[model samples]
Target: QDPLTINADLQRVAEESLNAAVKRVGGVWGSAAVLEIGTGRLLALAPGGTRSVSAIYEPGSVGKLVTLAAAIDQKKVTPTSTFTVSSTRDMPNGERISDDSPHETQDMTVAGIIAHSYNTGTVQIGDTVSDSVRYEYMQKFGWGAKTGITLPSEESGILRPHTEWGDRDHYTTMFGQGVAVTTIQLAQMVAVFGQKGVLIPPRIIDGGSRQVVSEDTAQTVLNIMQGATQPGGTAEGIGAVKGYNVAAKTGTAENVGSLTDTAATFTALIPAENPKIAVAVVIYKENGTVYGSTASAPVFVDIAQFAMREMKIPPSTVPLYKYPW
Candidate 1:
């Protein structure tokens, strides 16, 4: 019934990042969005329309966060829980699983697998719980459902019920291949974690919020995610901010048909110790080399840095999360 409270400066910053990224990568299409952590307001939008909120695409490794959260919240694992991870792994049925980057078999923490974005390690962690357990966590994180953003034609991304899943479904779903999520949905997750597990329904207009997970679970995951921006993590070089503790994840989903064009995606929350804004960016390349770390990460970094300053968010005082070697 009333107008949204969008920050003009942040809006322009996000739009420019979106446009510049698509142009820089020669991408076919893209979109970006920002939400206030505590308030759930759509602070900024991109590409001059509703595409940022309306379109749904595979979240790739970004979905791993949900998988890990489920395992942690269910008391199946902790951030420091250890597993031996290798570059390639075999499923119980003998199907092989591999990670994008190569690595020797090594013991890694639950957060370590995430820091490195390891499919093998993630599947190992996911194995700690049943497929239904992970699926329930995804639902709790707002997957397979509209975010109630007050936009027309918004998609409820695909998440087949665990019981309805095929034998191979767990493989893909655990690592973000089968599950689909909207850009705003990714933002919603960041906001949820940022608020220490409280889920504020993202709204173009004003809205209410609720708790989704225990503050302990939320706090642990937040710290664990910051591993990505530190030394030896997936988003390491590109994700680090000079004065901030950054919680971020990058994703690359390939061979998505013509209707869905994104090959690279990233979601991040700034001053990770105390978040203010959450931003999500996606870029679809029609051809050539692209990975979330290479494609959308820089764009996400640029917008997040700008958003921090624009919102007057000070640098974090807490030390960034460290990976145990």
Candidate 2:
């Protein structure tokens, strides 16, 4: 049976489902993505309301997936590769950067930056990796790339060169500021990483779709990205399950600088043995405790857990492991 089915309006059901989840815990708008474990077909995508895509909100930290994907696509760094941002002054654009963050250095790797939402650290890495290479990576990974989906303003976001970067542009773009992306764009990026590197087109017309990139590059990206949720990765706060060789990234994107308008996002891949499902979720205008760690990662956990249960994913004996140190 279809779990539980009704002939009623799915829109109403969707609204109730989304609202119930958020109202019980607390959140604003949201979107959910589901991928088949075998064929990589996107099964379900619930954009709580059209509100998620209707607004040209900032993708905030979720945009870092582009930066991370570009670096991985070029093989410039691995998930475990380490980098540093000594302070705000470490930015390469020759601008005076300022943040309420305390004076400290971030010892982060590529995956670390993605999983944990490190701003200065990622910008520093973006500095080392030339903007030209990064820009190409963006093209390859489909950042400014078109979704080809039928929507209101279905188009690519903007990416300016570091030289052309303004004060906010230089810093924010590095850690996913200055850019504005649609929900589908972010999901496609995560799907590519989950597929290991293949940038799959968002299957809007039908649920199943054809392969987009080669499996080699696809796995390379996904393998390196696994470091994000590992022991030392940024999202280590979200506890791990005993059997899943799961990988995920957390993003805290700000739309209006209101702090209240921030977006919390989580993307995940599970069953490291031959892998099956990829999930992406975003909760917008998080006025509650659900920032990256609390808001997004947990949603990913729930979605992943449900999928695993439905798929009957058998337990594995392998010790929980991430990429190398």
TM-scores, in order shown? 0.94, 0.77
Write down the lDDT of every candidate, Cα atoms only: 0.81, 0.59
Error of 1 at 311 (Å): 1.8
Clash pairs (backbone) in predicted model 2: 37-276, 60-253, 172-177, 196-218, 196-219, 197-218, 290-295
Instruction: Score candidate 2 by lDDT.
Output: 0.59
lDDT of 2 by residue, 206-307 (tens): 410444444665675566556665765656757354567776666676666455567667766776545676666667665544565556666566556556
Stretch of 10 with least lDDT, candidate 1: 254-263
Regions of model 1 farther than 4 Å from truth:
258-262
In angstroms, what RMSD does candidate 1 have relative to the true structure?
2.4
Per-residue lDDT of model 1, residues 1-325, tens digit only: 4477677877787778778888888887787878888888888877657777777777788888888887888889998899888889888966788988677898888888888888888988888888877887788888899998787778888898999877578788887777888888888987778997888888787520666678888888888889888777878888776788889988888646643455688888888878888888888776654578877888778777877787778888778877574
For every candidate, C-alpha RMSD to the true structure in Å: 2.4, 4.7
Query: Which residue pairs show backbone clashes in model 1?
Result: none
What's the distance in Å from true for residue 322, model 2? 2.7
